Write a protein that binds this ligand. Structure first.
Ligand SMILES: CCCCC/C=C\C/C=C\CCCCCCCC(=O)O
Lengths: 49, 49
């Protein structure tokens, strides 16, 4: 596809193990920000967003 | 030089001790990727590269 991810980061699970796991529930939240506000989307951060 | 490094990150080594160390063997791998693929060159990652 044409996604071309620049940032991909996970907590509580390691990326090399996702192919061997089963989940009981998954949710997906989606929105649009600007480039300087991307680092703000993380647990334990501060700022306007 | 004209390298102008943008990513310099080391594992199993502190940058401030590189001048006081002696090594039994050193290998160097080199190649070309694109800008959004640079973060994939690290242990324990996923992606196409
Ligand atoms: C002149 C400073 C005097 C006060 C210093 C001490 C307290 C305040 C410290 C930090 C202020 C951070 C600014 C807001 C940053 C938001 C996050 C971001 O934008 O990503």
């Amino acid at each position: 596809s044409s996604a071309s991810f620049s940032t991909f980061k996970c907590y509580g699970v390691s990326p090399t193990k996702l192919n061997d796991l089963c989940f009981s529930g998954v949710y997906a939240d989606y929105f649009v920000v600007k480039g300087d506000h991307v680092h703000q989307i993380a647990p334990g951060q501060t700022g306007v967003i």
